[PDB]
Design a protein around this ligand. Structure first.
Ligand SMILES: *[C@@H]1O[C@H](CO)[C@@H](O[C@@H]2O[C@H](CO)[C@@H](O)[C@H](O)[C@H]2NC(C)=O)[C@H](O)[C@H]1NC(C)=O
Ligand SMILES: *[C@@H]1O[C@H](CO)[C@@H](O[C@@H]2O[C@H](CO)[C@@H](O)[C@H](O)[C@H]2NC(C)=O)[C@H](O)[C@H]1NC(C)=O
Ligand SMILES: *[C@@H]1O[C@H](CO)[C@@H](O[C@@H]2O[C@H](CO)[C@@H](O)[C@H](O)[C@H]2NC(C)=O)[C@H](O)[C@H]1NC(C)=O
Ligand SMILES: *[C@@H]1O[C@H](CO)[C@@H](O[C@@H]2O[C@H](CO)[C@@H](O)[C@H](O)[C@H]2NC(C)=O)[C@H](O)[C@H]1NC(C)=O
Ligand SMILES: O=C(O)CNC(=O)[C@@H](CS)Cc1ccccc1
Ligand SMILES: O=C(O)CNC(=O)[C@@H](CS)Cc1ccccc1
Ligand SMILES: *[C@@H]1O[C@H](CO)[C@@H](O)[C@H](O)[C@H]1NC(C)=O
Ligand SMILES: *[C@@H]1O[C@H](CO)[C@@H](O)[C@H](O)[C@H]1NC(C)=O
Ligand SMILES: *[C@@H]1O[C@H](CO)[C@@H](O)[C@H](O)[C@H]1NC(C)=O
Ligand SMILES: [Zn+2]
Ligand SMILES: [Zn+2]
Lengths: 696, 696
């Protein structure tokens, strides 16, 4: 009665290697399911996080390398451009010869860097303006500085595009880094030294004298100004409510309530917005509807920018433009980021060149890379199986509504309607394989050179912003895929109300026709339930079935959701992470993902129980003394067998909206009654507390 | 009748995942046993060769990391010094903060580097001499330049040490690289560029002017000088006969035959040899017996060294010294080797720091690191079982002498006599665990500092050469192990007539108590046969049972041996390696290893069939539709599932005395009648040619 086939041996052996039978499952199920993984695997020098989830990304990068490094001649122009971009990225010999010339030759286009110019006031200072300066970095290179301008979807009109105004990102991962005290001591030191090291090497290449006394003082003005901008930004905890962030107004209204003064002159919003939208031939009148997401940031931005000169402003705006480009120059400019990269990620060396180029080509040509990947790794028979698995889990969430006691009847009536209206995207769009002409025309305006890699990334920056800004007057494409097929992940779209499962995640240990059903539901089954619950967490619940930001909750049901979810904010907020110096996780930022974990793990187990009583039990796996009910939670846990670097542990707490894999297993199973039933966990154990959170 | 234990499950899955069931075992058994490995495992960026053999080493380095990183309160002095050395090695922050100062401060000790010296003739030219320059690089750092000097075991008196004089190695892997054409074109370009880069970095750190043209002139003379020296060395194919290399002559006879003139003055051999041995306070008279291995090289060296100045010679001798230390300095000096390292190994990055550190401490403190390894990963119950396996294969070799028709009766008895006198070493020396005083006393003179890694490696260089030079008047210690315990390899000593099997290799897939006997005989059993046959190949046969280079072969048997061995010279010479760009294997320089492979697997298989006759058939493995006779050859082949980088396939084809793993499987099994019977291979198939080579 025990399976003995080839696939059952390879499946069971993988589970036996990762787990540790000597540990108790009810004391620490992470160390029970990953005890063997922790002893065997060591964090590579190029990885800030290493887990079975990250290994799958590396194995996918391998397949991308085989289909790109091989000039298969009989390829369409799109695939040729995809490979030519790949070759230009790997030839370090040609890149190391230019030094920093390709970056220094286009600096006059972004009004130059004042620290690296002999006389900047006479050459650029006369025609300088904060409007055209921010616009050039935005419209041409996609670098959002000072004010973040981008054309996105209308939250209350999912069919239209609209201009968004929000606070920008920072040179450091988060605004918490600009405290520069305690755990952020080395980061700020390596960040200012990153400026100085680049400032020294740039002046040396232009034949200008090295005035080291001015560089140490002028670059601290860039840090002093950016700390004030970080202090003026709004915390990410106060930005999780989409209803509170939506502030639509006209451009003339933006000029009235959010005025700015640059160099003693008032800032012109119409001039700034038109300097961006003129690149795509679109005029922005004063009655243009614009959604402002950070109104408090723009208010605090006025008293700060009036205290700095145009030279001090261009030093910060140009530095943000250069710090993301020194890694594409010669080795003399690549290694200047090592100290800065080590402070934020702990990696001693950058990842493999072919690995970076495989991700970059997959990021800028996701339809062509996905074409080669699905033809060389993805099996076509996986479509109908995942389609049926979604329908099973979709129906599970519908039936689970009546079991939930924290919602009234009217809220569940249309909460089911949103779940019924969820559309699905599985595998890859069919037009990237059957229509070579459409794929060729998609990258028609792209022209890559074999020995001009820096001119190809600049062309990709201009092409990305040009494509995005042109959608302002156009409707939202209903057939557009939000991701490529060569991605080991899953997604949910609040504005589209759809769940997307690319081919990169439809593989072991998530899903396989040759692995047990207890592992499929424990793998991809929890994934499907995760993305479906994402339409009902602290962010997606504010969107209706049509992707519009409309309140369909009653006051009693909406208040109970905040009460049910408050349990998880305190649970994950009390988790002390030993890899981050005992610091705790953010129970507010990780809330949306924790709701999808605890909700998805229960729906996957429910859909699996419905499959067992319908199709019968399964034969046990040889070599492991666990029933298929216990194998369900084992496969779920073994997905996140991993460990973090100390530097990235502090980074993921403030930047990653997910919890670490250690606590994604602990927190989700602590609130799972079906987990404690399968392993017969005693009362008040670490994995079976009497107080359990429950939302979906 | 199928094994169902947890160890059998992961053992069978390893066999299933590595093999390719779609391939034909009789068309290409390498593809049949490794086709799955080739798709599953890809060469890392830090590996010139990646195979199942190298993975066992990569896994062992992890165990070394765990037993060396964290200090413990009960550690003995020897363990404390190893961890002190390891901690000094991993601190990349302290290493980068020193730049090249540890090397610049040391360079005067080797008469400096003329190209990187402000005035080499004024500082070192007065007291410079070739006798002292070669001697200091030999006795203090182990850098053998121009003339190779070392104190080793007498070939004909295995109980005595004696001075050896031989041709040195080169900066490139072999003399063939100095053709600098075709597959060697890139190596020479990066070689000279390597010299120029280091010459620029050292002068820049010294604050000296940089002359691009002058450095290029002096470094091309270095290549020009080393081209002649390489052209003067005897080919490796002409150095496999130990009887033809043994030329014992007095020091006065060396001065007469191999006179050298340098800078117009005659070279004093007595001055040179005594400048080395004075470091251990040993005088070398002119009656001293010396073994000269390369008389043709020393003669061809006469007209070469006269045409070069003291600056030209020192520019080459110091460069050989510097090129091996540049990877121990800051990152700037590490990156100067990138183009050179990629040309010879294909690696785009240096391996992980902790991996190099663990391997370095394991190499300089093998008894301390071996102690920490066997106490943490090696089961002592393995030694008795391996002792029993050696006795079976040893008896099989003696019984095989009756089947050999190419030997007369009196030579068979002498072959049996040497086989009976073979000593064995299994696991680890007992002293490293049971005698803490002896282990601490071994490293008494070593004293490491926490933050001076370069000072520690230089101290290890003096101590390493000092320990061997002081053995000149000492008898060869018979109990002294020839390898550390934490080594994944096996060794045979011709002078000791003993076979060694360290604990690192007594592990899966070689040996395991939880492993099928068919796999143990195909794994460690073949290794034991490989080691015993080493004493009877084209080199081992020239030594008697006590390890002395004496002729015990009749003229007919010696002629018949060379005829039987000539078969394998053609068989392996005709193998064309695709990874090497179509180059063929060196059947002469790989003859000994090919003989040991062919003879060994036949002994292990015959020993396995004798075991099955007495103990009975074993249980089949799950998911594998193969019998145990087939699993014998399968486990033997799966040890060598791997691939080479093209840059290193050219390297290993001239340096590695072993054949590639691809052809060790093909070549050995092509000559195995039992293999073609076990898999039912038709005659004249690729794996079953009707003409088969046979020695042992
Ligand atoms: C990678 O880039 C290098 C440098 O641009 C290329 O090497 C050049 O190749 C052209 C081919 O005609 C020669 O004329 C140049 O003299 C070469 N320059 C150097 C410095 O060697 C190289 O060809 C590129 N790699 C590939 C695969 O195209
Ligand atoms: C935004 O304002 C700038 C200047 O404030 C405008 O640039 C001027 O353009 C006119 C002709 O279009 C020139 O005669 C001026 O010399 C320019 N001024 C400077 C300082 O260069 C720019 O045209 C405005 N943007 C839009 C879209 O009208
Ligand atoms: C390698 O060394 C050999 C000698 O050991 C060189 O052969 C000599 O070449 C010169 C002319 O260059 C002749 O006059 C001699 O008669 C040759 N002698 C022998 C024994 O062949 C050979 O040229 C050297 N090759 C290189 C590349 O340096
Ligand atoms: C060292 O030199 C001596 C003398 O030149 C060599 O001995 C001679 O070898 C030849 C054979 O070619 C004989 O004909 C002579 O009678 C020998 N003379 C003496 C005095 O022994 C000796 O072979 C040389 N050794 C090496 C290793 O080349
Ligand atoms: O963003 C990441 O780092 C990984 N992505 C994730 O953790 C989610 C993205 S919502 C997808 C997923 C859900 C459930 C199980 C597996 C995977
Ligand atoms: O040194 C090497 O590269 C590999 N060493 C070997 O191949 C031999 C050392 S001669 C040991 C061995 C024999 C047979 C099988 C496994 C291992
Ligand atoms: C941050 O800004 C607030 C007002 O916006 C101000 O009161 C506070 O002092 C600022 N803090 C820092 C560190 O600049
Ligand atoms: C590494 O060296 C630096 C500088 O010498 C020192 O500050 C640091 O403490 C060292 N690290 C360890 C682990 O000893
Ligand atoms: C070699 O000769 C030099 C000069 O004659 C002398 O100073 C030196 O001591 C000699 N070497 C030895 C080892 O005696
Ligand atoms: Zn998620
Ligand atoms: Zn060998």
């Amino acid at each position: 009665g025990i399976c003995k086939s080839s696939d059952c041996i390879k499946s069971a052996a993988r589970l036996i290697q990762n787990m540790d039978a000597t540990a108790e499952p009810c004391t620490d199920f992470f160390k029970y399911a990953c005890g063997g993984w922790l002893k065997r695997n060591v964090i590579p020098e190029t990885s800030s996080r290493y887990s079975n989830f990250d290994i799958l990304r590396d194995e996918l990068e391998v397949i991308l390398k085989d289909v790109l490094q091989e000039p298969k001649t009989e390829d369409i122009v799109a695939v040729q451009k995809a490979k030519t971009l790949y070759r230009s990225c790997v030839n370090e010999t040609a890149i190391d010869s230019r030094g920093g010339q390709p970056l220094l030759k286009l600096l006059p286009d972004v009004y130059g860097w004042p620290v690296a110019t002999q006389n900047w006031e006479q050459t650029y200072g006369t025609s300088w303006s904060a409007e055209k300066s921010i616009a050039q970095l935005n419209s041409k290179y996609g670098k959002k500085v000072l004010i973040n301008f981008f054309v996105g979807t209308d939250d209350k009109n999912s069919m239209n595009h609209i201009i968004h105004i929000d606070q920008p990102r920072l040179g450091l991962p988060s605004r918490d880094y600009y405290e520069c005290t305690g755990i952020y001591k080395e980061a700020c030191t390596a960040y200012v030294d990153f400026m100085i090291a680049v400032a020294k090497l740039i002046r040396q290449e232009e034949g200008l004298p090295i005035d080291e006394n001015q560089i140490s003082v002028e670059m601290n003005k860039v840090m002093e100004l950016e700390k004030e901008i970080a202090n003026a930004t709004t915390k990410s905890e106060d930005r999780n409510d989409p209803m509170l962030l939506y502030n639509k107004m006209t451009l003339a209204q933006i000029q009235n309530n959010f005025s700015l003064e640059i160099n003693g002159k008032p800032f012109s919003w119409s001039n700034f917005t038109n300097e961006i939208m003129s690149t795509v031939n679109i005029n922005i009148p004063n009655e243009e509807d614009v959604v402002v997401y950070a109104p408090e940031y723009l208010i605090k931005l006025k008293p700060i920018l009036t205290k700095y000169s145009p030279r001090d402003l261009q030093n910060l705006m140009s530095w943000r433009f250069i710090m993301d480009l020194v890694s594409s120059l010669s080795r003399t400019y690549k290694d200047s980021r090592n100290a800065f990269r080590k402070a934020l990620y702990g990696t001693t060396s950058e990842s493999a060149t072919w690995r970076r180029c495989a991700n970059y080509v997959n990021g800028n040509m996701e339809n062509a890379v996905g074409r080669l990947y699905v033809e060389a790794a993805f099996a076509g028979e996986s479509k109908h199986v995942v389609e049926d698995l979604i329908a099973q889990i979709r129906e599970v969430f519908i039936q689970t509504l009546d079991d939930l006691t924290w919602m009234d009847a009217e809220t569940k009536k249309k909460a089911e309607e949103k779940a019924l209206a969820i559309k699905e995207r599985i595998g890859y769009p069919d037009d990237i394989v059957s229509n070579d002409n459409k794929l060729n025309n998609e990258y028609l305006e792209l022209n890559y050179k074999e020995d001009e890699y820096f001119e190809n990334i600049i062309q990709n920056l201009k092409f990305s912003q040009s494509k995005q800004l042109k959608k302002l007057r156009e409707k939202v494409d209903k057939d557009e895929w939000i991701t490529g097929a060569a991605i080991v992940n899953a997604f949910y779209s609040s504005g589209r109300n759809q769940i997307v499962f690319p081919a990169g995640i439809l593989q072991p240990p998530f899903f396989s026709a040759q692995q047990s059903n207890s592992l499929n539901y424990g793998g991809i089954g929890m994934v499907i339930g995760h993305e479906i619950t994402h339409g009902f967490d602290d962010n997606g619940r504010n969107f209706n079935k049509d992707g519009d930001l409309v309140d369909w909750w009653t006051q009693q049901s909406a208040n109970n959701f905040k009460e049910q979810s408050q349990c998880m904010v305190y649970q994950y907020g009390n988790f002390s992470w030993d890899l981050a110096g005992g610091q705790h996780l953010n129970g507010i930022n990780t809330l949306g993902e924790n709701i999808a974990d605890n909700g998805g793990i229960g729906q996957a187990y429910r859909a699996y129980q419905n499959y067992v009583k319908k199709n019968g039990e399964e034969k046990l796996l040889p070599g492991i003394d666990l029933n298929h009910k216990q194998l369900f939670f084992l496969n779920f846990a073994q997905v996140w067998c991993g460990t973090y670097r100390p530097e990235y542990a502090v980074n993921s707490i403030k930047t990653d909206v997910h919890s670490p894999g250690n606590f994604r297993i602990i927190g989700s199973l602590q609130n799972s009654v079906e987990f404690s039933e399968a392993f017969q966990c005693p009362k008040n154990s670490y994995m079976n507390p009497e107080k359990k959170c429950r939302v979906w």
